[PDB]
PDB file of C-alpha atoms and ligand atoms in Angstrom:
ATOM      1  CA  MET A   1      -0.423   0.038  -0.355  1.00  0.00           C
ATOM      2  CA  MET A   2       1.330   3.768  -1.524  1.00  0.00           C
ATOM      3  CA  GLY A   3       0.042   6.836  -2.383  1.00  0.00           C
ATOM      4  CA  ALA A   4      -0.836   7.336  -5.559  1.00  0.00           C
ATOM      5  CA  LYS A   5       0.063  10.056  -7.815  1.00  0.00           C
ATOM      6  CA  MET A   6      -1.749  12.747  -7.321  1.00  0.00           C
ATOM      7  CA  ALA A   7      -0.058  15.999  -9.421  1.00  0.00           C
ATOM      8  CA  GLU A   8      -2.878  17.274 -11.845  1.00  0.00           C
ATOM      9  CA  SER A   9      -1.572  17.326 -15.391  1.00  0.00           C
ATOM     10  CA  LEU A  10      -3.055  18.127 -19.134  1.00  0.00           C
ATOM     11  CA  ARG A  11      -4.778  16.403 -22.258  1.00  0.00           C
ATOM     12  CA  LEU A  12      -3.051  17.146 -25.039  1.00  0.00           C
ATOM     13  CA  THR A  13      -3.733  16.237 -28.287  1.00  0.00           C
ATOM     14  CA  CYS A  14      -0.334  15.612 -30.258  1.00  0.00           C
ATOM     15  CA  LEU A  15      -0.418  17.410 -33.501  1.00  0.00           C
ATOM     16  CA  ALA A  16       1.729  15.718 -35.233  1.00  0.00           C
ATOM     17  CA  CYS A  17       0.280  12.095 -34.750  1.00  0.00           C
ATOM     18  CA  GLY A  18      -3.321  12.652 -33.247  1.00  0.00           C
ATOM     19  CA  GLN A  19      -2.490  11.117 -29.322  1.00  0.00           C
ATOM     20  CA  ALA A  20      -3.435  12.147 -26.575  1.00  0.00           C
ATOM     21  CA  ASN A  21      -0.548  12.529 -24.101  1.00  0.00           C
ATOM     22  CA  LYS A  22      -0.702  13.659 -20.957  1.00  0.00           C
ATOM     23  CA  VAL A  23       1.913  16.646 -19.619  1.00  0.00           C
ATOM     24  CA  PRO A  24       2.885  17.627 -16.000  1.00  0.00           C
ATOM     25  CA  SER A  25       0.529  20.768 -15.220  1.00  0.00           C
ATOM     26  CA  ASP A  26       4.328  22.072 -14.167  1.00  0.00           C
ATOM     27  CA  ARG A  27       5.980  20.895 -16.884  1.00  0.00           C
ATOM     28  CA  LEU A  28       3.566  23.304 -19.352  1.00  0.00           C
ATOM     29  CA  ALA A  29       7.838  25.162 -20.005  1.00  0.00           C
ATOM     30  CA  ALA A  30       9.870  22.380 -20.215  1.00  0.00           C
ATOM     31  CA  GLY A  31       9.280  21.566 -23.609  1.00  0.00           C
ATOM     32  CA  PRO A  32       7.222  17.956 -22.438  1.00  0.00           C
ATOM     33  CA  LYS A  33       7.771  14.998 -25.834  1.00  0.00           C
ATOM     34  CA  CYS A  34       5.231  12.547 -27.485  1.00  0.00           C
ATOM     35  CA  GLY A  35       5.404   9.928 -26.752  1.00  0.00           C
ATOM     36  CA  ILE A  36       4.447   7.892 -29.698  1.00  0.00           C
ATOM     37  CA  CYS A  37       5.620  10.256 -32.185  1.00  0.00           C
ATOM     38  CA  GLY A  38       8.260  12.608 -30.537  1.00  0.00           C
ATOM     39  CA  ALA A  39       6.577  15.748 -31.238  1.00  0.00           C
ATOM     40  CA  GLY A  40       7.022  18.426 -29.065  1.00  0.00           C
ATOM     41  CA  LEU A  41       4.049  19.357 -27.420  1.00  0.00           C
ATOM     42  CA  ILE A  42       3.697  22.540 -26.379  1.00  0.00           C
ATOM     43  CA  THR A  43       6.864  23.956 -29.172  1.00  0.00           C
ATOM     44  CA  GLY A  44       5.426  28.293 -28.566  1.00  0.00           C
ATOM     45  CA  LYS A  45       5.287  27.492 -33.023  1.00  0.00           C
ATOM     46  CA  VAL A  46       1.979  27.437 -34.753  1.00  0.00           C
ATOM     47  CA  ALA A  47       0.941  23.434 -36.646  1.00  0.00           C
ATOM     48  CA  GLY A  48      -1.108  23.300 -39.943  1.00  0.00           C
ATOM     49  CA  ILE A  49      -3.196  20.224 -38.304  1.00  0.00           C
ATOM     50  CA  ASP A  50      -5.275  18.349 -40.940  1.00  0.00           C
ATOM     51  CA  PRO A  51      -9.148  18.047 -39.460  1.00  0.00           C
ATOM     52  CA  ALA A  52      -8.935  14.305 -37.953  1.00  0.00           C
ATOM     53  CA  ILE A  53      -6.185  15.791 -35.372  1.00  0.00           C
ATOM     54  CA  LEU A  54      -8.332  19.839 -35.071  1.00  0.00           C
ATOM     55  CA  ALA A  55     -10.948  16.848 -33.963  1.00  0.00           C
ATOM     56  CA  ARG A  56      -8.908  15.189 -31.174  1.00  0.00           C
ATOM     57  CA  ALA A  57      -7.177  18.921 -30.463  1.00  0.00           C
ATOM     58  CA  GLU A  58     -10.419  20.752 -29.824  1.00  0.00           C
ATOM     59  CA  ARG A  59     -11.220  18.370 -26.034  1.00  0.00           C
ATOM     60  CA  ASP A  60      -7.102  19.448 -24.599  1.00  0.00           C
ATOM     61  CA  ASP A  61      -6.938  20.493 -21.092  1.00  0.00           C
ATOM     62  CA  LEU A  62      -5.112  23.136 -22.844  1.00  0.00           C
ATOM     63  CA  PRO A  63      -7.101  26.083 -24.960  1.00  0.00           C
ATOM     64  CA  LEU A  64      -6.369  25.754 -28.822  1.00  0.00           C
ATOM     65  CA  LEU A  65      -6.264  28.350 -31.005  1.00  0.00           C
ATOM     66  CA  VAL A  66      -7.265  27.431 -34.539  1.00  0.00           C
ATOM     67  CA  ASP A  67      -6.515  29.801 -38.240  1.00  0.00           C
ATOM     68  CA  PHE A  68      -8.726  28.583 -40.724  1.00  0.00           C
ATOM     69  CA  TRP A  69      -7.494  29.918 -43.607  1.00  0.00           C
ATOM     70  CA  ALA A  70      -7.238  29.421 -47.015  1.00  0.00           C
ATOM     71  CA  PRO A  71      -4.235  30.711 -49.270  1.00  0.00           C
ATOM     72  CA  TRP A  72      -6.322  32.187 -51.999  1.00  0.00           C
ATOM     73  CA  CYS A  73      -7.524  34.856 -49.381  1.00  0.00           C
ATOM     74  CA  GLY A  74      -4.832  37.365 -48.830  1.00  0.00           C
ATOM     75  CA  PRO A  75      -5.496  38.823 -45.945  1.00  0.00           C
ATOM     76  CA  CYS A  76      -4.918  35.028 -44.437  1.00  0.00           C
ATOM     77  CA  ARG A  77      -1.272  35.552 -46.259  1.00  0.00           C
ATOM     78  CA  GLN A  78      -1.376  38.013 -44.564  1.00  0.00           C
ATOM     79  CA  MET A  79      -2.372  37.340 -41.822  1.00  0.00           C
ATOM     80  CA  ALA A  80       0.173  34.308 -41.381  1.00  0.00           C
ATOM     81  CA  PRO A  81       3.022  36.098 -39.998  1.00  0.00           C
ATOM     82  CA  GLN A  82       1.143  37.623 -37.214  1.00  0.00           C
ATOM     83  CA  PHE A  83      -0.440  34.078 -36.242  1.00  0.00           C
ATOM     84  CA  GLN A  84       2.824  33.178 -35.239  1.00  0.00           C
ATOM     85  CA  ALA A  85       4.013  35.768 -33.301  1.00  0.00           C
ATOM     86  CA  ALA A  86       1.110  35.999 -31.424  1.00  0.00           C
ATOM     87  CA  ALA A  87       1.900  32.000 -30.847  1.00  0.00           C
ATOM     88  CA  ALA A  88       5.433  33.310 -29.534  1.00  0.00           C
ATOM     89  CA  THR A  89       2.915  35.519 -27.181  1.00  0.00           C
ATOM     90  CA  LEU A  90       1.379  32.983 -25.515  1.00  0.00           C
ATOM     91  CA  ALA A  91       3.411  29.443 -25.789  1.00  0.00           C
ATOM     92  CA  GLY A  92       2.333  27.820 -22.424  1.00  0.00           C
ATOM     93  CA  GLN A  93      -1.251  29.147 -22.312  1.00  0.00           C
ATOM     94  CA  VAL A  94      -2.600  28.592 -25.638  1.00  0.00           C
ATOM     95  CA  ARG A  95      -1.801  26.394 -28.072  1.00  0.00           C
ATOM     96  CA  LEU A  96      -2.420  27.617 -32.446  1.00  0.00           C
ATOM     97  CA  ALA A  97      -2.394  25.207 -35.014  1.00  0.00           C
ATOM     98  CA  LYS A  98      -4.141  26.680 -38.754  1.00  0.00           C
ATOM     99  CA  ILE A  99      -5.893  25.028 -40.977  1.00  0.00           C
ATOM    100  CA  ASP A 100      -6.080  24.918 -44.711  1.00  0.00           C
ATOM    101  CA  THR A 101      -9.542  25.452 -45.714  1.00  0.00           C
ATOM    102  CA  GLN A 102      -9.285  24.862 -49.536  1.00  0.00           C
ATOM    103  CA  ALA A 103      -7.268  21.334 -47.959  1.00  0.00           C
ATOM    104  CA  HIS A 104      -9.925  20.417 -46.483  1.00  0.00           C
ATOM    105  CA  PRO A 105     -13.345  21.544 -47.935  1.00  0.00           C
ATOM    106  CA  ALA A 106     -15.464  19.765 -44.684  1.00  0.00           C
ATOM    107  CA  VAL A 107     -13.618  21.416 -42.013  1.00  0.00           C
ATOM    108  CA  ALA A 108     -15.609  25.054 -43.351  1.00  0.00           C
ATOM    109  CA  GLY A 109     -19.334  23.478 -42.662  1.00  0.00           C
ATOM    110  CA  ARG A 110     -18.151  21.588 -38.983  1.00  0.00           C
ATOM    111  CA  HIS A 111     -17.344  25.000 -37.578  1.00  0.00           C
ATOM    112  CA  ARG A 112     -19.927  27.298 -40.014  1.00  0.00           C
ATOM    113  CA  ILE A 113     -16.962  28.510 -40.669  1.00  0.00           C
ATOM    114  CA  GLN A 114     -17.926  32.285 -42.189  1.00  0.00           C
ATOM    115  CA  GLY A 115     -15.215  34.960 -43.170  1.00  0.00           C
ATOM    116  CA  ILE A 116     -11.551  34.244 -43.508  1.00  0.00           C
ATOM    117  CA  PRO A 117      -9.217  34.437 -41.594  1.00  0.00           C
ATOM    118  CA  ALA A 118     -10.692  33.229 -38.668  1.00  0.00           C
ATOM    119  CA  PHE A 119     -10.372  32.451 -35.437  1.00  0.00           C
ATOM    120  CA  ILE A 120     -11.290  29.810 -32.979  1.00  0.00           C
ATOM    121  CA  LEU A 121     -10.600  29.791 -29.140  1.00  0.00           C
ATOM    122  CA  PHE A 122     -11.171  25.986 -28.304  1.00  0.00           C
ATOM    123  CA  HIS A 123     -11.798  24.772 -24.593  1.00  0.00           C
ATOM    124  CA  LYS A 124     -11.836  21.052 -23.308  1.00  0.00           C
ATOM    125  CA  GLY A 125     -14.231  20.547 -26.344  1.00  0.00           C
ATOM    126  CA  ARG A 126     -16.513  23.483 -26.164  1.00  0.00           C
ATOM    127  CA  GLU A 127     -16.030  26.527 -28.846  1.00  0.00           C
ATOM    128  CA  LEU A 128     -15.093  29.922 -26.721  1.00  0.00           C
ATOM    129  CA  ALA A 129     -14.805  32.528 -28.483  1.00  0.00           C
ATOM    130  CA  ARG A 130     -14.522  33.055 -31.815  1.00  0.00           C
ATOM    131  CA  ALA A 131     -12.930  36.227 -34.059  1.00  0.00           C
ATOM    132  CA  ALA A 132     -13.044  36.494 -38.042  1.00  0.00           C
ATOM    133  CA  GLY A 133     -10.755  39.396 -40.179  1.00  0.00           C
ATOM    134  CA  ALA A 134      -6.816  39.662 -40.118  1.00  0.00           C
ATOM    135  CA  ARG A 135      -5.395  41.948 -37.204  1.00  0.00           C
ATOM    136  CA  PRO A 136      -2.265  42.602 -35.351  1.00  0.00           C
ATOM    137  CA  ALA A 137      -1.252  39.618 -32.934  1.00  0.00           C
ATOM    138  CA  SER A 138      -0.726  41.731 -29.976  1.00  0.00           C
ATOM    139  CA  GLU A 139      -4.960  42.938 -31.097  1.00  0.00           C
ATOM    140  CA  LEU A 140      -5.643  39.096 -31.358  1.00  0.00           C
ATOM    141  CA  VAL A 141      -3.507  38.486 -28.321  1.00  0.00           C
ATOM    142  CA  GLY A 142      -5.852  40.283 -26.083  1.00  0.00           C
ATOM    143  CA  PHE A 143      -9.197  38.690 -27.580  1.00  0.00           C
ATOM    144  CA  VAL A 144      -8.185  35.064 -26.506  1.00  0.00           C
ATOM    145  CA  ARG A 145      -6.564  36.395 -22.579  1.00  0.00           C
ATOM    146  CA  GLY A 146     -10.176  38.394 -22.293  1.00  0.00           C
ATOM    147  CA  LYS A 147     -12.133  35.149 -22.979  1.00  0.00           C
ATOM    148  CA  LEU A 148      -9.733  33.138 -20.705  1.00  0.00           C
ATOM    149  CA  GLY A 149      -9.800  35.033 -17.554  1.00  0.00           C
TER     150      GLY A 149
ATOM    151  CA  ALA B   1     -13.922  11.680   2.992  1.00  0.00           C
ATOM    152  CA  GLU B   2     -11.501   9.225   3.199  1.00  0.00           C
ATOM    153  CA  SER B   3      -8.103   7.343   1.583  1.00  0.00           C
ATOM    154  CA  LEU B   4      -9.080   4.081  -1.207  1.00  0.00           C
ATOM    155  CA  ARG B   5      -7.626   1.216  -0.724  1.00  0.00           C
ATOM    156  CA  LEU B   6      -7.835   0.181  -4.550  1.00  0.00           C
ATOM    157  CA  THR B   7      -5.542  -1.892  -6.739  1.00  0.00           C
ATOM    158  CA  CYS B   8      -3.485  -0.771 -10.198  1.00  0.00           C
ATOM    159  CA  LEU B   9      -6.000  -3.101 -12.515  1.00  0.00           C
ATOM    160  CA  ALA B  10      -2.759  -2.984 -14.483  1.00  0.00           C
ATOM    161  CA  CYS B  11       0.497  -3.834 -11.831  1.00  0.00           C
ATOM    162  CA  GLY B  12      -1.561  -5.467  -9.180  1.00  0.00           C
ATOM    163  CA  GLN B  13      -0.488  -3.066  -7.398  1.00  0.00           C
ATOM    164  CA  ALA B  14      -1.926  -1.615  -4.055  1.00  0.00           C
ATOM    165  CA  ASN B  15      -2.151   2.479  -4.621  1.00  0.00           C
ATOM    166  CA  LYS B  16      -4.366   4.696  -1.274  1.00  0.00           C
ATOM    167  CA  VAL B  17      -6.239   7.154  -2.849  1.00  0.00           C
ATOM    168  CA  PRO B  18      -8.191  10.365  -0.582  1.00  0.00           C
ATOM    169  CA  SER B  19     -12.481   9.402  -1.331  1.00  0.00           C
ATOM    170  CA  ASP B  20     -12.830  12.814  -2.616  1.00  0.00           C
ATOM    171  CA  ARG B  21     -10.274  13.801  -5.545  1.00  0.00           C
ATOM    172  CA  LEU B  22     -11.012  10.905  -7.445  1.00  0.00           C
ATOM    173  CA  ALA B  23     -11.720  12.755 -10.668  1.00  0.00           C
ATOM    174  CA  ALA B  24      -8.950  13.910  -9.970  1.00  0.00           C
ATOM    175  CA  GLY B  25      -6.726  11.710 -12.073  1.00  0.00           C
ATOM    176  CA  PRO B  26      -5.098   9.910  -9.944  1.00  0.00           C
ATOM    177  CA  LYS B  27      -2.211   7.487 -11.330  1.00  0.00           C
ATOM    178  CA  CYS B  28      -0.486   3.753  -9.583  1.00  0.00           C
ATOM    179  CA  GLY B  29       2.467   4.811  -7.928  1.00  0.00           C
ATOM    180  CA  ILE B  30       4.604   2.096  -8.908  1.00  0.00           C
ATOM    181  CA  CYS B  31       2.955   2.042 -13.607  1.00  0.00           C
ATOM    182  CA  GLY B  32       2.037   4.888 -14.150  1.00  0.00           C
ATOM    183  CA  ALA B  33      -1.236   3.873 -14.401  1.00  0.00           C
ATOM    184  CA  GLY B  34      -4.270   5.285 -13.790  1.00  0.00           C
ATOM    185  CA  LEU B  35      -6.565   3.828 -11.407  1.00  0.00           C
ATOM    186  CA  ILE B  36     -10.220   5.994 -11.768  1.00  0.00           C
ATOM    187  CA  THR B  37     -10.358   6.308 -16.108  1.00  0.00           C
ATOM    188  CA  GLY B  38     -14.101   4.736 -16.654  1.00  0.00           C
ATOM    189  CA  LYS B  39     -12.763   3.093 -19.126  1.00  0.00           C
ATOM    190  CA  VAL B  40     -12.939  -1.241 -19.164  1.00  0.00           C
ATOM    191  CA  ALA B  41      -9.633  -3.111 -18.258  1.00  0.00           C
ATOM    192  CA  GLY B  42      -9.336  -6.479 -19.804  1.00  0.00           C
ATOM    193  CA  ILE B  43      -7.271  -7.791 -16.338  1.00  0.00           C
ATOM    194  CA  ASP B  44      -5.996 -11.332 -16.005  1.00  0.00           C
ATOM    195  CA  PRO B  45      -6.127 -13.090 -12.737  1.00  0.00           C
ATOM    196  CA  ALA B  46      -4.035 -12.495 -10.406  1.00  0.00           C
ATOM    197  CA  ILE B  47      -5.024  -8.571 -10.968  1.00  0.00           C
ATOM    198  CA  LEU B  48      -8.529  -9.966 -10.200  1.00  0.00           C
ATOM    199  CA  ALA B  49      -8.132 -11.549  -7.158  1.00  0.00           C
ATOM    200  CA  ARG B  50      -6.281  -8.838  -5.940  1.00  0.00           C
ATOM    201  CA  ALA B  51      -8.958  -6.063  -6.825  1.00  0.00           C
ATOM    202  CA  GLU B  52     -11.793  -8.332  -5.630  1.00  0.00           C
ATOM    203  CA  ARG B  53     -10.810  -6.452  -1.905  1.00  0.00           C
ATOM    204  CA  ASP B  54     -10.503  -2.724  -3.426  1.00  0.00           C
ATOM    205  CA  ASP B  55     -12.302   0.623  -1.561  1.00  0.00           C
ATOM    206  CA  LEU B  56     -13.956   1.194  -4.183  1.00  0.00           C
ATOM    207  CA  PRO B  57     -16.974  -1.251  -5.904  1.00  0.00           C
ATOM    208  CA  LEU B  58     -15.756  -3.473  -8.308  1.00  0.00           C
ATOM    209  CA  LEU B  59     -17.712  -4.855 -11.852  1.00  0.00           C
ATOM    210  CA  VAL B  60     -16.018  -7.784 -13.554  1.00  0.00           C
ATOM    211  CA  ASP B  61     -17.656  -8.623 -16.730  1.00  0.00           C
ATOM    212  CA  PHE B  62     -16.679 -12.703 -17.392  1.00  0.00           C
ATOM    213  CA  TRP B  63     -16.737 -12.526 -20.950  1.00  0.00           C
ATOM    214  CA  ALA B  64     -15.247 -15.523 -23.630  1.00  0.00           C
ATOM    215  CA  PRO B  65     -15.191 -13.869 -27.419  1.00  0.00           C
ATOM    216  CA  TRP B  66     -16.808 -16.957 -29.187  1.00  0.00           C
ATOM    217  CA  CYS B  67     -19.616 -16.237 -27.035  1.00  0.00           C
ATOM    218  CA  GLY B  68     -22.170 -13.685 -29.626  1.00  0.00           C
ATOM    219  CA  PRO B  69     -24.320 -12.306 -26.550  1.00  0.00           C
ATOM    220  CA  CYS B  70     -20.797 -11.312 -25.271  1.00  0.00           C
ATOM    221  CA  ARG B  71     -19.064  -9.593 -28.379  1.00  0.00           C
ATOM    222  CA  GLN B  72     -22.610  -7.843 -28.041  1.00  0.00           C
ATOM    223  CA  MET B  73     -22.406  -6.772 -24.757  1.00  0.00           C
ATOM    224  CA  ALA B  74     -18.946  -5.646 -25.094  1.00  0.00           C
ATOM    225  CA  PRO B  75     -19.779  -2.477 -25.959  1.00  0.00           C
ATOM    226  CA  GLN B  76     -22.281  -1.547 -23.963  1.00  0.00           C
ATOM    227  CA  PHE B  77     -20.370  -2.754 -20.756  1.00  0.00           C
ATOM    228  CA  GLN B  78     -17.878   0.474 -22.007  1.00  0.00           C
ATOM    229  CA  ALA B  79     -20.239   2.030 -21.803  1.00  0.00           C
ATOM    230  CA  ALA B  80     -21.650   1.087 -18.695  1.00  0.00           C
ATOM    231  CA  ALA B  81     -18.027   1.880 -17.397  1.00  0.00           C
ATOM    232  CA  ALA B  82     -17.824   5.320 -18.928  1.00  0.00           C
ATOM    233  CA  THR B  83     -21.495   6.322 -17.311  1.00  0.00           C
ATOM    234  CA  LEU B  84     -20.066   4.977 -13.358  1.00  0.00           C
ATOM    235  CA  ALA B  85     -16.621   6.004 -13.389  1.00  0.00           C
ATOM    236  CA  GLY B  86     -16.070   7.774 -10.105  1.00  0.00           C
ATOM    237  CA  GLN B  87     -18.557   5.014  -8.181  1.00  0.00           C
ATOM    238  CA  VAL B  88     -17.382   2.112 -10.139  1.00  0.00           C
ATOM    239  CA  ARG B  89     -14.249   0.696 -11.799  1.00  0.00           C
ATOM    240  CA  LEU B  90     -15.289  -1.815 -14.263  1.00  0.00           C
ATOM    241  CA  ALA B  91     -12.931  -4.618 -15.807  1.00  0.00           C
ATOM    242  CA  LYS B  92     -13.911  -7.862 -18.122  1.00  0.00           C
ATOM    243  CA  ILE B  93     -11.779 -11.404 -18.216  1.00  0.00           C
ATOM    244  CA  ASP B  94     -11.265 -13.757 -20.808  1.00  0.00           C
ATOM    245  CA  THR B  95     -12.631 -17.033 -19.276  1.00  0.00           C
ATOM    246  CA  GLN B  96     -11.592 -19.032 -21.984  1.00  0.00           C
ATOM    247  CA  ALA B  97      -8.048 -16.852 -21.901  1.00  0.00           C
ATOM    248  CA  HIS B  98      -7.888 -18.110 -17.880  1.00  0.00           C
ATOM    249  CA  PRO B  99      -9.575 -21.095 -18.186  1.00  0.00           C
ATOM    250  CA  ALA B 100      -9.741 -21.914 -14.562  1.00  0.00           C
ATOM    251  CA  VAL B 101     -11.327 -18.764 -13.315  1.00  0.00           C
ATOM    252  CA  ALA B 102     -14.947 -19.301 -14.265  1.00  0.00           C
ATOM    253  CA  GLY B 103     -15.135 -22.427 -11.651  1.00  0.00           C
ATOM    254  CA  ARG B 104     -13.236 -20.132  -9.118  1.00  0.00           C
ATOM    255  CA  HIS B 105     -16.469 -17.791  -9.522  1.00  0.00           C
ATOM    256  CA  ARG B 106     -19.258 -20.349  -9.605  1.00  0.00           C
ATOM    257  CA  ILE B 107     -19.845 -18.578 -13.259  1.00  0.00           C
ATOM    258  CA  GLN B 108     -21.922 -20.979 -15.516  1.00  0.00           C
ATOM    259  CA  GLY B 109     -23.593 -18.366 -18.352  1.00  0.00           C
ATOM    260  CA  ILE B 110     -22.164 -15.777 -19.792  1.00  0.00           C
ATOM    261  CA  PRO B 111     -21.966 -13.066 -19.290  1.00  0.00           C
ATOM    262  CA  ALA B 112     -21.857 -12.393 -16.270  1.00  0.00           C
ATOM    263  CA  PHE B 113     -20.763  -9.814 -13.800  1.00  0.00           C
ATOM    264  CA  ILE B 114     -19.865  -9.761  -9.966  1.00  0.00           C
ATOM    265  CA  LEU B 115     -19.955  -6.537  -8.435  1.00  0.00           C
ATOM    266  CA  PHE B 116     -17.103  -7.008  -5.509  1.00  0.00           C
ATOM    267  CA  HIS B 117     -16.282  -4.642  -1.474  1.00  0.00           C
ATOM    268  CA  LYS B 118     -14.285  -4.995   0.442  1.00  0.00           C
ATOM    269  CA  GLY B 119     -13.592  -9.163  -0.626  1.00  0.00           C
ATOM    270  CA  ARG B 120     -18.313  -9.177  -0.347  1.00  0.00           C
ATOM    271  CA  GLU B 121     -19.344 -10.014  -3.375  1.00  0.00           C
ATOM    272  CA  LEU B 122     -22.755  -7.559  -3.855  1.00  0.00           C
ATOM    273  CA  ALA B 123     -24.111  -9.018  -6.258  1.00  0.00           C
ATOM    274  CA  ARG B 124     -24.325 -11.190  -9.569  1.00  0.00           C
ATOM    275  CA  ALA B 125     -26.387 -10.791 -12.688  1.00  0.00           C
ATOM    276  CA  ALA B 126     -26.036 -13.318 -15.530  1.00  0.00           C
ATOM    277  CA  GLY B 127     -26.510 -12.980 -19.383  1.00  0.00           C
ATOM    278  CA  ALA B 128     -26.360  -9.154 -21.821  1.00  0.00           C
ATOM    279  CA  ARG B 129     -28.385  -6.191 -21.069  1.00  0.00           C
ATOM    280  CA  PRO B 130     -28.242  -2.553 -22.346  1.00  0.00           C
ATOM    281  CA  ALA B 131     -25.368  -0.528 -20.142  1.00  0.00           C
ATOM    282  CA  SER B 132     -28.524   1.343 -19.013  1.00  0.00           C
ATOM    283  CA  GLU B 133     -29.860  -1.749 -17.607  1.00  0.00           C
ATOM    284  CA  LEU B 134     -26.826  -2.836 -15.276  1.00  0.00           C
ATOM    285  CA  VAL B 135     -26.616   0.649 -14.872  1.00  0.00           C
ATOM    286  CA  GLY B 136     -29.242   0.675 -12.300  1.00  0.00           C
ATOM    287  CA  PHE B 137     -29.038  -2.569 -11.153  1.00  0.00           C
ATOM    288  CA  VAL B 138     -25.183  -1.788 -10.083  1.00  0.00           C
ATOM    289  CA  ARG B 139     -26.325   1.816  -8.561  1.00  0.00           C
ATOM    290  CA  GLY B 140     -29.478  -0.353  -6.310  1.00  0.00           C
ATOM    291  CA  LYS B 141     -26.646  -2.704  -5.186  1.00  0.00           C
ATOM    292  CA  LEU B 142     -25.436   0.087  -3.971  1.00  0.00           C
ATOM    293  CA  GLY B 143     -27.823   1.722  -2.409  1.00  0.00           C
TER     294      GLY B 143
HETATM  295 ZN1   ZN C   1       2.752  12.610 -31.965  1.00  0.00          ZN
HETATM  296 ZN1   ZN C   2       0.217  -0.157 -11.764  1.00  0.00          ZN
HETATM  297 ZN1   ZN C   3     -12.816 -13.762  -7.200  1.00  0.00          ZN
END
């Protein structure tokens, strides 16, 4: 009879292979890696993900912010570097990902995507908020932090 | 609120868990397996022997893959496990793979369910049923 391990952890989907991983709440800054494919789970970077990974990632214990974008759209192209800067800023608090709605045509209907770039904030399988239209990194960070508060 | 002895259904190790934190995803301090998963663990006779004695009720599906009603019952037993998460832990044991366990539990027909708590048999049922019915039965035996 020994004590059980009671340290809180967060369910994170690996954005590279889709594996459900558990990360100690105190190791968010330790560069944890997926136990299956080795990909960093909290990189502060933007992963381009597919519809299967997206459906899994929406259910995570750490908030997920997704840029629904398409390369033919000028504002989406301009937004890409802004979204990368937001990711660096939000590293450890929110994970950022993007999904090309031209490459993956069924995702738009599933999330009632309207104008693009569209940003949806997910947490534990719920959509917390959304915004659409290109904007500076800091404005998006502010919007996100406001919704998490 | 009290502390509960739970058998790790993976490693067999006796773990102590506060009763108020059963939803906190406690892990076996040896092997690291989640102790309260809300899922069905396929266990062996050694682990079963220990887990019968736990402070949280344990419901065991005695099954075999050759049995059509058992195959049908499997996803119903998984549904029951989700519903009962934190109240009752669910496990199954393959009586074909482990051919002595059924005799040792006076099991005839399968699927058969035995509800254990602190080394006592609380209840027994035999034959496939919907998840809602099994959950209802088990909850009734616990109050
Ligand atoms: Zn991975
Ligand atoms: Zn263990
Ligand atoms: Zn027994």
